[PDB]
Amino acid sequence: PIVQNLQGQMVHQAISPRTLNAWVKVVEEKAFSPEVIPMFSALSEGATPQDLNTMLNTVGGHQAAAQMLKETINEEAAEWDRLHPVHAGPIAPGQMREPRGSDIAGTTSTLQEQIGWMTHNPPIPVGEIYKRWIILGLNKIVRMYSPTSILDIRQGPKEPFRDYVDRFYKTLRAEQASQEVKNWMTETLLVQNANPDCKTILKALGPGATLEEMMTACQGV
Amino acid sequence: PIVQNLQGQMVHQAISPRTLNAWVKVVEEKAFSPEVIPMFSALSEGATPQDLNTMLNTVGGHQAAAQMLKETINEEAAEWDRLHPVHAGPIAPGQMREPRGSDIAGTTSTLQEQIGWMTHNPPIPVGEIYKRWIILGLNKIVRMYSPTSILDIRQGPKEPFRDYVDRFYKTLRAEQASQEVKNWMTETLLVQNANPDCKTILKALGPGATLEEMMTACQGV
Amino acid sequence: PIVQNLQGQMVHQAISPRTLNAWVKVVEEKAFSPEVIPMFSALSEGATPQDLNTMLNTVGGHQAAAQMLKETINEEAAEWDRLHPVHAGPIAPGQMREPRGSDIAGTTSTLQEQIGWMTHNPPIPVGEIYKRWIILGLNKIVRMYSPTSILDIRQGPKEPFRDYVDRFYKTLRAEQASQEVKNWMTETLLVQNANPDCKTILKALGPGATLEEMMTACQGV
Amino acid sequence: PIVQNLQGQMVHQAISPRTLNAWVKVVEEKAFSPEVIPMFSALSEGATPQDLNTMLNTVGGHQAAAQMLKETINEEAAEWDRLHPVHAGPIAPGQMREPRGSDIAGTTSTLQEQIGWMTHNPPIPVGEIYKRWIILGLNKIVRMYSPTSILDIRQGPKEPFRDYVDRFYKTLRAEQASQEVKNWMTETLLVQNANPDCKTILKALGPGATLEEMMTACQGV
Numbered sequence: 001p002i003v004q005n006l007q008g009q010m011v012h013q014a015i016s017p018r019t020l021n022a023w024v025k026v027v028e029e030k031a032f033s034p035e036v037i038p039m040f041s042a043l044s045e046g047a048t049p050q051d052l053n054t055m056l057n058t059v060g061g062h063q064a065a066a067q068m069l070k071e072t073i074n075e076e077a078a079e080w081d082r083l084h085p086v087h088a089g090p091i092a093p094g095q096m097r098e099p100r101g102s103d104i105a106g107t108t109s110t111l112q113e114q115i116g117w118m119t120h121n122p123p124i125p126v127g128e129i130y131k132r133w134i135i136l137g138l139n140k141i142v143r144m145y146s147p148t149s150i151l152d153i154r155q156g157p158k159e160p161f162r163d164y165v166d167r168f169y170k171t172l173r174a175e176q177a178s179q180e181v182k183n184w185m186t187e188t189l190l191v192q193n194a195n196p197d198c199k200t201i202l203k204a205l206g207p208g209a210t211l212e213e214m215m216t217a218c219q220g221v
Numbered sequence: 222p223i224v225q226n227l228q229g230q231m232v233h234q235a236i237s238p239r240t241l242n243a244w245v246k247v248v249e250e251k252a253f254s255p256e257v258i259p260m261f262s263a264l265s266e267g268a269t270p271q272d273l274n275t276m277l278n279t280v281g282g283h284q285a286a287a288q289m290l291k292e293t294i295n296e297e298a299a300e301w302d303r304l305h306p307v308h309a310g311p312i313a314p315g316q317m318r319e320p321r322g323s324d325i326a327g328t329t330s331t332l333q334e335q336i337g338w339m340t341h342n343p344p345i346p347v348g349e350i351y352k353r354w355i356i357l358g359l360n361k362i363v364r365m366y367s368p369t370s371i372l373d374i375r376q377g378p379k380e381p382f383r384d385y386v387d388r389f390y391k392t393l394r395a396e397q398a399s400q401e402v403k404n405w406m407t408e409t410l411l412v413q414n415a416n417p418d419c420k421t422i423l424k425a426l427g428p429g430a431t432l433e434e435m436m437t438a439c440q441g442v
Numbered sequence: 443p444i445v446q447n448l449q450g451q452m453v454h455q456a457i458s459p460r461t462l463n464a465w466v467k468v469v470e471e472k473a474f475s476p477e478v479i480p481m482f483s484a485l486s487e488g489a490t491p492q493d494l495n496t497m498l499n500t501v502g503g504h505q506a507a508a509q510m511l512k513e514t515i516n517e518e519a520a521e522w523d524r525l526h527p528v529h530a531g532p533i534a535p536g537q538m539r540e541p542r543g544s545d546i547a548g549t550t551s552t553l554q555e556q557i558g559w560m561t562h563n564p565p566i567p568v569g570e571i572y573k574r575w576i577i578l579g580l581n582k583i584v585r586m587y588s589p590t591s592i593l594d595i596r597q598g599p600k601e602p603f604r605d606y607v608d609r610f611y612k613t614l615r616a617e618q619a620s621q622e623v624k625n626w627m628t629e630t631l632l633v634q635n636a637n638p639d640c641k642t643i644l645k646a647l648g649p650g651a652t653l654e655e656m657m658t659a660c661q662g663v
Numbered sequence: 664p665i666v667q668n669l670q671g672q673m674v675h676q677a678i679s680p681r682t683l684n685a686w687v688k689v690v691e692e693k694a695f696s697p698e699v700i701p702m703f704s705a706l707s708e709g710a711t712p713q714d715l716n717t718m719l720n721t722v723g724g725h726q727a728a729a730q731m732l733k734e735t736i737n738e739e740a741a742e743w744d745r746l747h748p749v750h751a752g753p754i755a756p757g758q759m760r761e762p763r764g765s766d767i768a769g770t771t772s773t774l775q776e777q778i779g780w781m782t783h784n785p786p787i788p789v790g791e792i793y794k795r796w797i798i799l800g801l802n803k804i805v806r807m808y809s810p811t812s813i814l815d816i817r818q819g820p821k822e823p824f825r826d827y828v829d830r831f832y833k834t835l836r837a838e839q840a841s842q843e844v845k846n847w848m849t850e851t852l853l854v855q856n857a858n859p860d861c862k863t864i865l866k867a868l869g870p871g872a873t874l875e876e877m878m879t880a881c882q883g884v
């Protein structure tokens with residue numbers, strides 16, 4: 001991340017060892033469950049591309065996931081280069097140059113360049129964009145590692161309704177379908193795959209019932 | 222949160238990555254149990270509205286809970302605007318303006334505005350009010366996610382009395398009934414739903430026995 | 443329909459009794475299956491609004507379906523009136539007036555008016571629009587009368603794959619989901635609900651396999 | 664189709680509603696069995712491309728079959744354009760222009776153009792060629808929808824020989840193998856897959872026995 005020294009200057013600060021160890025635990029203990037994605041977003045808060053690559057080195061041990069991440073990052077960098085062509089001409093002395101795809105990801109750039117790019121009025125977030133590419137890669141990995149399809153999430157005969165809803169929504173978050181498809185799933189498949197008692201109650205509740213009403217009517221069933 | 226620099230000026234400090242990761246773990250691992258509410262109150266201690274929105278982004282993955290939170294926040298903001306009309310007239314140069322409902326929640330305000338609003342003599346807490354709205358939303362979510370009714374909390378035939386009391390009071394905290402209703406529950410339903418031996422002992426103890434006496438008389442039963 | 447007399451003039455021709463009897467058989471024998479919709483479209487080919495109302499009189503015996511049709515027609519007529527306001531001013535002697543919502547459906551118009559409206563260069567199809575409203579109503583009825591959800595269409599242990607595909611697509615046509623949802627269904631649910639042998643083969647076939655390849659690989663299984 | 668008016672002029676006549684309904688019944692009730700192909704050829708006798716598209720609208724409900732038909736028609740139109748290049752130069756006033764691939768199928772042409780093209784001395788059949796393309800598409804669909812391979816057509820232990828022959832030849836018509844392969848099938852596989860008594864009789868009959876002799880020798884077996 002970026003901090004301020006006693007002179008009021010922006011200086012890069014390395015990720016603390018225990019934050020890196022928390023990220024390592026997340027990678028090595030959660031088997032790329034969907035919750036890995038928010039946690040990363042919390043653990044890389046306000047990070048620099050060098051810090052993001054340091055965090056990615058933990059994923060580098062997982063060869064398949066690391067390869068998927070590298071493919072996603074390369075594709076995003078190519079798209080960024082395509083959408084941000086290198087302008088030919090004079091550059092203002094007070095304005096910094098435009099980083100390339102290999103520079104925003106920190107493969108070739110230096111620390112001072114990223115510090116200057118991130119701290120500006122208005123700021124151009126390179127760390128945030130690299131983080132978004134990382135999150136895209138992580139979402140792909142979570143989809144790859146999902147053990148069950150949403151069509152296979154069925155409420156158990158004695159399973160409480162809240163646990164079934166939690167499993168259903170966790171699987172839905174893992175699968176990352178289209179928004180309309182997700183809405184159709186939450187409206188139809190959740191009722192369809194419930195156990196007979198909750199299914200009867202939800203059918204009696206009618207279409208268009210909110211999730212709160214559904215969980216209320218099935219609370220102790 | 223807000224800290225003081227070497228110049229004695231109030232400056233916003235971002236939430237540390239491990240605090241955000243602790244909040245992420247709370248959201249993603251505790252299934253909106255009642256204890257999520259104190260923990261949030263601990264983890265957002267002295268926070269700014271921007272920090273509170275950063276913490277809410279973790280809840281944003283949970284679509285139903287996020288929608289309930291957004292509804293509660295919008296209702297609270299509308300009530301705040303209704304109870305705090307925008308005064309038309311001159312404003313003192315030394316007195317800051319009054320934030321609106323979309324400004325206290327940090328949807329439209331800036332960091333410097335919130336820093337100035339929170340640090341004053343006397344202070345007007347915007348972060349605390351936003352936190353209270355968040356806690357209202359979280360209480361609604363905990364009520365929604367409660368798996369069992371208080372009427373269904375019954376002591377097991379071999380369950381120790383202290384565990385039954387703990388489950389009963391946890392469910393009572395989840396349900397959030399009216400204060401008189403809660404008092405009636407703790408006075409009558411706790412005795413009513415106990416197992417036969419503890420029920421006999423508590424009936425012999427008589428009405429109006431304190432919880433300490435009840436747990437004493439049933440300690441090893 | 444409309445025919446030409448020996449004088450070269452457009453004259454309305456009534457629907458033949460056996461065409462009406464075919465429509466009656468479709469209504470009374472097919473229980474509003476999806477195939478009722480193409481057949482109607484074939485049987486009302488080039489029809490006038492009076493003819494369409496004559497055909498609807500067969501549906502009028504089915505009270506619920508007739509009420510749904512009347513609701514759909516009234517809604518479509520109201521939308522047509524909203525989108526086609528009655529212009530105030532002179533009307534060309536050679537140009538016919540604009541029919542209203544109650545006039546295109548033939549509730550108040552006469553035969554000569556519809557004959558003149560339909561036969562023009564360029565023609566303004568009133569019979570076709572009324573037919574489209576009828577088809578909307580019929581689609582609603584078919585959705586209402588569908589006996590099974592698409593989620594409940596599962597291949598039998600000894601059922602041939604082509605029959606399962608036919609049932610699946612018939613149910614999909616009955617349900618009339620959104621196009622993206624329909625694509626998701628045909629891509630995922632068809633494989634998901636197949637019997638174990640065909641399911642194994644289709645999983646080996648991989649995602650993105652065309653329906654022809656799927657039916658080929660499962661032909662005799 | 665095309666009829667003659669009282670003035671001796673060729674005028675297009677629309678397909679009667681009951682012919683269209685017969686075609687709809689064929690499409691929706693026969694599951695693309697091989698007999699759908701002769702029936703279509705009977706029902707579209709002397710039809711125009713606009714009429715053929717009207718008949719295809721019934722198939723348009725069957726999404727996979729409609730897509731296969733559209734692919735076949737587009738391929739045939741491309742081949743027709745390749746084999747019939749647009750000549751650059753003068754055109755005789757008494758000779759009509761050459762329709763393109765999108766014009767013979769009636770996607771862009773008009774009714775009068777097709778009427779003039781079809782009625783000529785000598786006539787250039789555009790409806791017949793479009794019908795042949797439709798029949799190619801339908802043959803592809805029938806091959807796709809065939810439930811059993813010809814190798815899986817085996818005479819039942821008590822099945823009469825004529826029924827086995829009928830099933831065998833129906834499957835052979837569905838599969839549409841090469842002519843030499845079809846001859847090999849009818850000569851060898853029919854005897855190979857018969858039940859033991861008929862198989863013994865046919866083996867005694869010898870190679871090169873005609874189908875009439877085979878059905879005679881196995882009539883009551």
Ligand SMILES: O=P(O)(O)O[C@H]1[C@H](OP(=O)(O)O)[C@@H](OP(=O)(O)O)[C@H](OP(=O)(O)O)[C@@H](OP(=O)(O)O)[C@H]1OP(=O)(O)O
Nearest residue numbers: 017018019020021022023025026239240242243244246247
């Ligand atoms: O979410 P928190 O409540 O802040 O939990 C943390 C977390 O512990 P867990 O993830 O095991 O719950 C830290 O683990 P790290 O991933 O950073 O390693 C751990 O730090 P240690 O690594 O040093 O164990 C720390 O424990 P400590 O209090 O000893 O600093 C502990 O905080 P709490 O103990 O306050 O829960």
Ligand SMILES: O=P(O)(O)O[C@H]1[C@H](OP(=O)(O)O)[C@@H](OP(=O)(O)O)[C@H](OP(=O)(O)O)[C@@H](OP(=O)(O)O)[C@H]1OP(=O)(O)O
Nearest residue numbers: 459460461462463464465467680681682684685686688689
């Ligand atoms: O092959 P055909 O003997 O001429 O059969 C037709 C055919 O009936 P089926 O296909 O049910 O055997 C017609 O059905 P369409 O497909 O044209 O609808 C039907 O006409 P309807 O639709 O009006 O039932 C007509 O019956 P009708 O005699 O009432 O005209 C009937 O002819 P036959 O009754 O002479 O068999």
